[PDB]
Amino acid sequence: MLSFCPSCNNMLLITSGDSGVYTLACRSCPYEFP
Amino acid sequence: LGVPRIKEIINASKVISTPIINAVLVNDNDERAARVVKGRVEKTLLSDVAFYVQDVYKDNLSFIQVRIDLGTIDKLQLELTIEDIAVAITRASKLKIQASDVNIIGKDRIAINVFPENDVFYRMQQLRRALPDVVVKGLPDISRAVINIRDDGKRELLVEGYGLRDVMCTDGVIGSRTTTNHVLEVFSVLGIEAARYSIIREINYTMSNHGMSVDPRHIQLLGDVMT
Amino acid sequence: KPIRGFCQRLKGKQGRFRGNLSGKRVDFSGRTVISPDPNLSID
Amino acid sequence: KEAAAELELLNADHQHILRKLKKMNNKPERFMVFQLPTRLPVGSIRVHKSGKLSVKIGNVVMDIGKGAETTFLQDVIALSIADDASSAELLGRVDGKIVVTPQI
Amino acid sequence: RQNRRPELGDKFSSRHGQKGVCGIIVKQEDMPFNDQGIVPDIIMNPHGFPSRMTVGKMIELISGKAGVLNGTLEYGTCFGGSKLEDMSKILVDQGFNYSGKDMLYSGITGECLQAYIFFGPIYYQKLKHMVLDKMHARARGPRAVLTRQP
Amino acid sequence: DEINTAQDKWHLLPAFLKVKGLVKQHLDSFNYFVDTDLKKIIKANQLILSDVDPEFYLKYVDIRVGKKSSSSTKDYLTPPHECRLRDMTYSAPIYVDIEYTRGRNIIMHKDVEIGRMPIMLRSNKCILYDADESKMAKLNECPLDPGGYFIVNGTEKVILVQEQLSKNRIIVEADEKKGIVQASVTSSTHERKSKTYVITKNGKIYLKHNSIAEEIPIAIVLKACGILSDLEIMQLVCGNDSSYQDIFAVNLEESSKLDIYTQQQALEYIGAKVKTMRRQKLTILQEGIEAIATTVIAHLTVEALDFREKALYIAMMTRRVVMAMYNPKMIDDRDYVGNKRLELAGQLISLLFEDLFKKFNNDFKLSIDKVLKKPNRAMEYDALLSINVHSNNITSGLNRAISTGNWSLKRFKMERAGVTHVLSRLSYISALGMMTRISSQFEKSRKVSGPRALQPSQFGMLCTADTPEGEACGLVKNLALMTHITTDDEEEPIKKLCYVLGVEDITLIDSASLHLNYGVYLNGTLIGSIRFPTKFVTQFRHLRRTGKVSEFISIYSNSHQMAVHIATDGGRICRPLIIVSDGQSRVKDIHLRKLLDGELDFDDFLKLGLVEYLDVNEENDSYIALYEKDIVPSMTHLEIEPFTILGAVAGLIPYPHHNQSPRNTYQCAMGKQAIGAIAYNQFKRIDTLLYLMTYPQQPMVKTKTIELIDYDKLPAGQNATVAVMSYSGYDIEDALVLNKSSIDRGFGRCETRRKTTTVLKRYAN
Amino acid sequence: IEEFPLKISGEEESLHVFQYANRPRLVGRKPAEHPFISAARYKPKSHLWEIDIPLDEQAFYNKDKAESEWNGVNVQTLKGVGVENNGQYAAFVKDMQVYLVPIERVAQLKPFFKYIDDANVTRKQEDARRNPNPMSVKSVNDPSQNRLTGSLLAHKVADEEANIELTWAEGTFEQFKDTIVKE
Amino acid sequence: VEIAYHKCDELITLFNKGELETQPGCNEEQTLEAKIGGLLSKVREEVGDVCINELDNWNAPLIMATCGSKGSTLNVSQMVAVVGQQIISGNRVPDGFQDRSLPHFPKNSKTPQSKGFVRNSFFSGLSPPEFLFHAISGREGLVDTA
Ligand SMILES: [Zn+2]
């Protein structure tokens, strides 16, 4: 869904965040976004 | 209607091809009521009634959001409430969800939330494609109902689907004059002597429009060797 | 290349039961061409 | 028909490539790559009557066609290596890319 | 080595695809004749040309008769060939009908025929599949060993 | 005789069949096998070696069929009609030259007899090549015989022109109850018989193969080839601003499930579930068994280091999967004539011979060291003494595979039978109409009447009116009168040629822009991604007509996708057509009158650029005009002669256009049965059953086709005097009535001859 | 009318071209910048290019996942294989002059994930440490047996060769005027 | 047959205008394909009606079709007037390659005399393009029996 992770263009992934927050962050790359 | 009509009549095979059912209405005019019952029987997919579906995030919410076009209910003359859609989500066993999590927000909006590894992203997206293909109103076994005109002012209802029991069970049709094809579902619904008279009426129909003429009696001997 | 057995000849298209028992070969027969003749009667 | 859509675009290619040839006269450490046809059987980029370019890179061998044609959303940078030593310097980035093709 | 003669049963053709069993062999004097004494070699019935739709044999007969009277062989090719309007001009100079359809007498009764007969030369190639080696007759003969049938 | 270019373009059709006859496809195939395609065999099976006594080597330097190097005369050969009266094979011996290690010194010995090759008639290795009715009268052989058929031990047989689907190319497929498949068979010439599938299970792309234990979804096998960044996948497959991103979007998240994300981790997921072939050593790295798993797959393209060009060939293979799921109208049929590869005799007898030849020198290898495992028998031992025991498996291998027409190969392990038939000497064109026919493969689609039917993409490629009926109704077909089967040349220089004309390369173009432009496809492989194709293709033909490139190419260029095609694979159909430049053709009747003078033949027409060969795929783009009175200022490729869409055995029908269409397929099945004359030597030959007619006559209404094969020089049947009418009722159901006096004068008195033979057998006692 | 003469003065320098498949050329019609290379890395006889790049800090970084998983921070390498071809000279343009130099290779830069490749190396190391459970003599090449070569042999030779840490500079006026003074 | 072309050739040209009559039966771009059939199935029969009444007695294919011995008023009409439009299993000769049937006809031209219809009689002759369209109806007449 246009989920490009810049500097790798790989993917994004809704990850289980702190206090249950719905953060999105991919593997194989140190990246995060609200 | 040729040899591949005689083949499955005498085989009495289960998966028949093109199993249209023939039903005659109650009234004679359209009056915006001859296709109000084709609305009551056609498998009304919700992608024809919805217009815009999207995922809305505040900070901590995982819910897909659905909106309907209320004017399309006015357009194709069908009749249904808004809450029976929210019934029809949890009446879908392929999307393995909890029974009662659904909440309306407004008049033309509806949203369902999900909650639990990595269940979060995957099953809000597997369900994003599996929500806009559910039946919300209509009979769950027919394919595509079509209204037509006969050589008189009376108009009937042609439905290209298997089920016949629930078609007799609906309103606006009369369950006295409703013929069909696929003989061996009449044997389930209408006993045994209706299956014997249906095999008769099928063989001598597909020999009337090929030109050859055998007899009535050579099919009446074939009907009784089966039943 | 597969070996014929007992069951591999009682069934099949004219192995038995169609080319041996139901439909046989008959003596006293003959097979030429046909040609028309008006000057003889029916039968 | 649709071949007349081609020649007018090739006219519109020359008027876009004489612009980028002329804005880069200020030698601002600017590079461009273009391909020459090898396997020879030096010259001069030159302007004809009413917007037309050609090169003649042999003694006689004329190459009429050129075209400023590709699309790249990439970063492209030229570097010179030498003998696998302390020889790493980025020369510059690349602005455009044209091609040369001989007429037949 | 043997040679033989075409008695009835021997299958002829027409080079356009009209098979035929030889049906009878009548004498010469029972065959019809034109004004000059030309007895036809072979008579075929009119009842093929509506169903078989072979207008080739109706043209091959016109382009053939006009070639005999002119002494020159003619071409029937595909998508071309010798035309019709330039071929009835030869066929009216020599004295015959413009459509090749001559008139002739009868050999049984003597008088003329109340219609006109389409008359001319057609190439009839002889086929294989003769009846000298298809007549079979088995009364009581050899029997196979595993089935004891004929 | 004021000649003009309106009705005298026919006069160059004899200029075609004079230099280049009607048995082109059989004679020019075996003649290429004997000359060149033997030397490419021994150069791939040279250097027979032993491991015991490692200073022994025997190498095959060169190979020849026919004459020696000592006498170097023509030959002395058993003549062909002398060879069919004795149940002998008509054959010529194979000669090789060798050097080998005798002992103290190596020794080079010439002209070693290893076998006897059978040679077909009217080839340039047999005695009937360019004779002049005086040498050929001495040999009592017919001048009008076609030639092209072996006389192995009596009976005379003919290898038939088989055809199959196009190897080394892909076809798209659709099915409702099964999903869709993507077959792509590839056969590189060394042991390789492999087909790959790109299947869709419930909305997901995969890739299965019959050496992988399971299937693999394609997002693995593109990160395995370097395309890893997972935006580059969708950027290659889908494009932009489309619904193709939505159908393909399921396969992206299966990288997140398997958690691979990188090109190093991408490989070992393949070879974890590869079916391991028994290597007998198994040095398996768990790093190189997957790097070769991207070498034994899709054997079109091989790699050196980058794995790159193999990747976006898989991406183009899976783009036409997604487009087929978007609408099933984009699919292709495997019955279109562009997807058929005709293959001749001499390029099929070479698949047999190198099976026999490697079976020769690995029985001859183990016969050496059975002697070389001796202490005394290692000094004076010579190897050519025991060569003749193994020579008999070449001759008896070739003669058994021609008589009983089933070829038992080893390299492909495949058992085609029915590949030879005995030719029928019923009539003259019954034995010439067999030499130009096609025997299909019957790929077991017996339910479907699609391939049983006839395609409109067949006009003048091969004949339309000759096809049998009954059990074989649409799978047996016949070449037309104007037809040439191409030959493959080379793909290295034309790939170097297309770079010069202004194409870019595959290793530089961005993947956002390869769908915006077109793409050159070389044998189905994208290499260059040309822009503005119509200046590129029209400058290509001007190299072809003027003659820089060979003429057997096709520049098919469709527009359903954004691609232009090249094809140089050989073994496909074509016919010649004269180039029309603009609203005036290139007919130039001063060239055509100079043809009749006899110095400007048909071959010099294509040397100048007045005529060229078009196949069925290059007829996609062209707009052939029927007649010179129909030229439009947008009209190319005037049709050279319109009755050439009928072969030499349908051609004898007079006025075929007036006649009905099923009454032309009823005559080709019976023209091969009409008795008549056979050859000039017909009272000399002893055949099994030979029908003759006493007094035949040439027909009255001839055809141009019957004078281009010399049919009327020995005709079949005679012209009666038909008086069409009903008579005596014995002519009702297309029976007919003839008179007794004409039969006694000799109307249709046939004659039947029948061989029978015995053999006086010599016993054990 | 007008004509611009070009001449070819370039030798002795095998200069390469890269292609960033990650960073775009222009951002909202505005031309972008190239990121600053920390150091370069080149492998002869296999032509690789492990260009290192830094990615920006905590704000868009999420070090708490980067530290605890692979313990490798602030370094994103990207592998490029040197691919060669003919044609394609490199041209810098003078006022009414244009001077060419041949390009030796063109390498394509793909994001090489280095750290999670190596995160499974200690994971593979710890496999046999929790499960410890336990002679090099010559043989003879046999002429009925084959050995690995071609594609997979080139990967056996491309992992073990000499590292070179390139002194990355940005000069190039020395390369300019040396070409200008030569005709 | 040219006044049947003149109604037909304008009826194809309403693709830029986009007229769609939408009969009951879910047409979806076949109204300009189904109307052409009965438009050509009227000129095929009405010219077959002209040739019967304007035809003298003692005509030979007339006097064995006034009986029931052999023939029809269809089979004689193809011999003197027109052989009509060939069908291929309920389809009027679909395209061969690249939205056309044969290289002698231009791209995506949906006219009759290009797909199926052949206007000239067996007595007149057949042209090299329209000869092949008769050799496909003549092919399915023998395949269908098997
Ligand atoms: Zn990332």
| Two tokens, residue F35 | 């000359």
- F206, containing H or E segment: strand F204-209
The structure's method of determination equals: cryo-EM
Chain B touches chain G, with at least 3 Cβ pairs below 8 Å, answer: no
What DSSP state is assigned to residue D53?
E
Q: Is the minimum CB–CB distance between H15 and chain E shorter than 8 Å? A: no
Q: What is the dihedral of CA G128, G129, G134, G137, to 10 degrees?
A: 70
Please identify which residue in the block is written with the tokens 């003359």.
B77
**F645:H122 CB<8 A:** no
| Pairing of the two strands G3-8 and G97-110 | parallel
* CA of residue H45 to ligand 1 center, whole Å: 73
Task: Give the max Cα distance, chain G.
Answer: 84
Listed residue (H99, H103, H137) closest to H118, CA to CA: H137
Across the A:F interface, residue pairs with CB atoms under 8 Å apart total: 22
Q: Which residues, at least 6 apart from G10, have a Cβ–Cβ distance to it below 8 Å?
A: G89, G90, G99, G100, G101, G102, G179
Q: What are phi and psi of F485, to 5 degrees?
A: -95, 130
Task: Count CB atoms within 10 A of the CB of residue G96.
Answer: 11
3-state SS, residue B160: coil
Q: What are phi and psi of B145, to 5 degrees?
A: -80, 140
Gyration radius of chain A over CA positions: 10
Q: Let me know: does A11 contact G39? Beta carbons within 8 Å.
A: no
The sign one gets for the Cα dihedral F276, F281, F284, F290 is: negative
Gyration radius of chain G over CA positions: 24
CA distance G113 to G77: 7
Q: What are phi and psi of H35, to 5 degrees?
A: -70, -25
Alpha helices in D1-104 (DSSP H): 4-22
**Reduced 3-state DSSP string for F110-124:** EEEEEEEEECCCCCC
CA distance F424 to F146: 13
Binding-site sequence positions of A for Zn(2+): 5, 8, 26, 29
**A22:B118 CB<8 A:** no
CA distance F166 to F93: 35
Listed residue (F347, F355, F361) closest to F397, CA to CA: F355
Transcribe F405-420 into DSSP letters.
-----SSS-------E
Q: Which residues, at least 6 apart from F608, have a Cβ–Cβ distance to it below 8 Å?
A: none
Gyration radius of chain C over CA positions: 19
CA distance F228 to F212: 22
Angle between helices G63-70 and G115-130 (to 10 degrees): 40
Q: What is the dihedral of CA H48, H52, H56, H58, to 10 degrees?
A: 100
Q: Among A13, A15, A22, whose Cβ lies nearest the Cβ of B62?
A: A22
3-state SS, residue H52: helix
**F735:C37 CB<8 A:** no
Starting at the earlier edge strand, list the strands of the sheet with F48-49.
F48-49, F57-65, F91-101, F106-118
3-state SS, residue B217: helix
The letter for the amino acid at B76 is L
- G153, containing H or E segment: helix G151-158
Q: Is the minimum CB–CB distance between E45 and chain H shorter than 8 Å? A: no
Transcribe F53-105 into DSSP letters.
STT-EEEEEEEEES--SSS--------HHHHTTTT---EEEEEEEEEEE-SSS
Listed residue (G82, G13, G43) closest to G165, CA to CA: G43
3-state SS, residue G165: strand
CA distance F611 to F605: 6
CA distance A20 to E1: 106
Q: Is the minimum CB–CB distance between F262 and chain A shorter than 8 Å? A: yes
| Two tokens, residue F600 | 């400007």
Q: Which residues, at least 6 apart from F318, have a Cβ–Cβ distance to it below 8 Å?
A: F182, F198, F205, F218, F237
Residue of F nearest to D102 (CA): F501
**Reduced 3-state DSSP string for chain E:** CEECCCCCCCEECCCCCCCEEEEEEECCCCCCCCCCCCCCCEEECCCCHHHHCCCHHHHHHHHHHHHHHHCCCEECCCCCCCCCCCCHHHHHHCCCCCCCCCCCECCCCCCECCCCCEEEEEEECECCCCHHHCCCCECCCCCCCCCCCC
Q: Exposed, middle or buried: residue F682 (CB in 10 Å: 0-12, 13-18, 19+)?
A: middle
Task: Give the max Cα distance, chain C.
Answer: 58
Smallest Cα distance from E63 to chain F, Å: 7
Q: Let me know: does D30 contact G93? Beta carbons within 8 Å.
A: yes
| CA-to-CA dists, residue B101 to B52, B90, B111, B114, angstroms | 21, 9, 10, 8
* CA of residue G59 to ligand 1 center, whole Å: 15
Q: Exposed, middle or buried: residue B156 (CB in 10 Å: 0-12, 13-18, 19+)?
A: middle
**E8:C35 CB<8 A:** yes
Task: Give the max Cα distance, chain D.
Answer: 58
| Pairing of the two strands B135-137 and B145-147 | unpaired
CA distance B200 to B225: 12
Alpha helices in F272-391 (DSSP H): 308-326, 349-360, 366-372
Q: Let me know: does D100 contact D37? Beta carbons within 8 Å.
A: yes
* CA of residue F257 to ligand 1 center, whole Å: 15
| Pairing of the two strands F57-65 and F91-101 | antiparallel
Neighbours of chain B (3+ CB pairs under 8 A): A, H
CA distance F251 to F262: 16
CA distance F565 to F556: 5
Q: Let me know: does G143 contact F51? Beta carbons within 8 Å.
A: yes
The sign one gets for the Cα dihedral F608, F521, F331, F170 is: positive
Q: Which residues, at least 6 apart from G122, have a Cβ–Cβ distance to it below 8 Å?
A: none
**H127:E79 CB<8 A:** yes
Q: Exposed, middle or buried: residue F409 (CB in 10 Å: 0-12, 13-18, 19+)?
A: middle
CA distance E19 to E54: 13
Chain G touches chain F, with at least 3 Cβ pairs below 8 Å, answer: yes
CA distance C25 to C19: 8
| Two tokens, residue F497 | 């040629």
Task: Count CB atoms within 10 A of the CB of residue E110.
Answer: 7
Q: What are phi and psi of B166, to 5 degrees?
A: -70, -25
The letter for the amino acid at F164 is Q
Residue of B nearest to H24 (CA): B148
**F729:C38 CB<8 A:** yes
Residue of E nearest to C28 (CA): E139
Q: Is the minimum CB–CB distance between H97 and chain F shorter than 8 Å? A: yes
The letter for the amino acid at F119 is I
Please identify which residue in the block is written with the tokens 């109204």.
H31
3-state SS, residue F487: coil
For chain D, counts of helices (H) and of strands (E): 1, 7
CA distance H17 to H15: 5
Q: What are phi and psi of F728, to 5 degrees?
A: 60, 10
To probe the interface with A, which of G20, G36, G37, G55 has the most A CB atoms within 10 Å? Answer: G55
**A10:F261 CB<8 A:** yes
* CA of residue F259 to ligand 1 center, whole Å: 13
Q: Which residues, at least 6 apart from C7, have a Cβ–Cβ distance to it below 8 Å?
A: none
| Two tokens, residue D4 | 């007349």
Task: Find residue G3's DSSP bridge partners.
Answer: D46
Residues in chain H whose C lies over 2.5 Å from the next residue's N (breaks after):
none
| Two tokens, residue F337 | 């004539």
CA distance G50 to F228: 16
The sign one gets for the Cα dihedral F438, F439, F443, F445 is: positive
Listed residue (F482, F452, F207, F166) closest to F321, CA to CA: F207
The letter for the amino acid at D15 is Q
Query: How far is Cα of residue F115 from the mean position of the Cα atoms in its chain?
Result: 27
3-state SS, residue F28: helix
Chain C touches chain E, with at least 3 Cβ pairs below 8 Å, answer: yes
Q: Among A25, A28, A30, whose Cβ lies nearest the Cβ of G55?
A: A30
| Two tokens, residue F19 | 């230099």
Q: Is the minimum CB–CB distance between H136 and chain F shorter than 8 Å? A: yes
Q: Which residues, at least 6 apart from F535, have a Cβ–Cβ distance to it below 8 Å?
A: D6, D65
Q: Let me know: does D61 contact D41? Beta carbons within 8 Å.
A: yes
- D102, containing H or E segment: none
CA distance F628 to F635: 11
CA distance E109 to E30: 9
**F231:A4 CB<8 A:** yes
Q: Is the minimum CB–CB distance between H98 and chain F shorter than 8 Å? A: yes
| Partners of residue F501 in chain D, C-beta under 8 Å | 101-102, 104
CA distance F681 to F84: 13
| Partners of residue F729 in chain C, C-beta under 8 Å | 36, 38
CA distance F683 to B30: 89
Q: Which residues, at least 6 apart from F373, have a Cβ–Cβ distance to it below 8 Å?
A: F52
Q: Is the minimum CB–CB distance between F754 and chain D shorter than 8 Å? A: no
Q: Let me know: does F314 contact F298? Beta carbons within 8 Å.
A: yes
Query: How far is Cα of residue B205 from the mean position of the Cα atoms in its chain?
Result: 26
- G122, containing H or E segment: helix G115-130
CA distance F217 to F203: 11
3-state helix, strand, coil in chain D (%, to 5): 20, 35, 45
To probe the interface with F, which of H78, H87, H143, H145 has the most F CB atoms within 10 Å? Answer: H143
Q: Is the minimum CB–CB distance between B148 and chain H shorter than 8 Å? A: yes
Task: Give the max Cα distance, chain F.
Answer: 98
Q: Let me know: does F525 contact F298? Beta carbons within 8 Å.
A: no
Q: Which residues, at least 6 apart from G135, have a Cβ–Cβ distance to it below 8 Å?
A: none
Please identify which residue in the block is written with the tokens 């419930």.
F202
CA distance F479 to H83: 28
Length of chain H: 146
What DSSP state is assigned to residue G37?
P
The letter for the amino acid at G114 is K
Please identify which residue in the block is written with the tokens 């055995």.
F649
| Two tokens, residue F90 | 């008509």
To probe the interface with H, which of E45, E47, E60, E83 has the most H CB atoms within 10 Å? Answer: E47
**G111:F229 CB<8 A:** yes
Please identify which residue in the block is written with the tokens 């290597």.
F279
Burial F709-727 (b: 16+ CB within 10 A, else e): bebeebbbbbbbbbbbbeb
Smallest Cα distance from D81 to chain F, Å: 20
Listed residue (B131, B137, B135) closest to B114, CA to CA: B131
Q: Which residues, at least 6 apart from H105, have a Cβ–Cβ distance to it below 8 Å?
A: H114, H129
Listed residue (F80, F751, F23, F714) closest to F428, CA to CA: F714
Q: What is the dihedral of CA G67, G68, G69, G70, to 10 degrees?
A: 40
Q: Which residues, at least 6 apart from F43, have a Cβ–Cβ distance to it below 8 Å?
A: none
| Two tokens, residue B25 | 């209405």
Angle between helices B193-203 and B217-226 (to 10 degrees): 140
CA distance F650 to F656: 9
| Two tokens, residue B27 | 């009234």
Listed residue (F117, F108, F42, F40) closest to F75, CA to CA: F117
Task: Find residue F118's DSSP bridge partners.
Answer: F91
Resolution attained, angstroms:
3.7
CA distance A20 to F407: 72
Q: Phi/psi zone of residue F452: left (φ > 0), alpha (ψ -120 to 50 degrees), beta?
A: alpha
Residue of H nearest to B145 (CA): H25
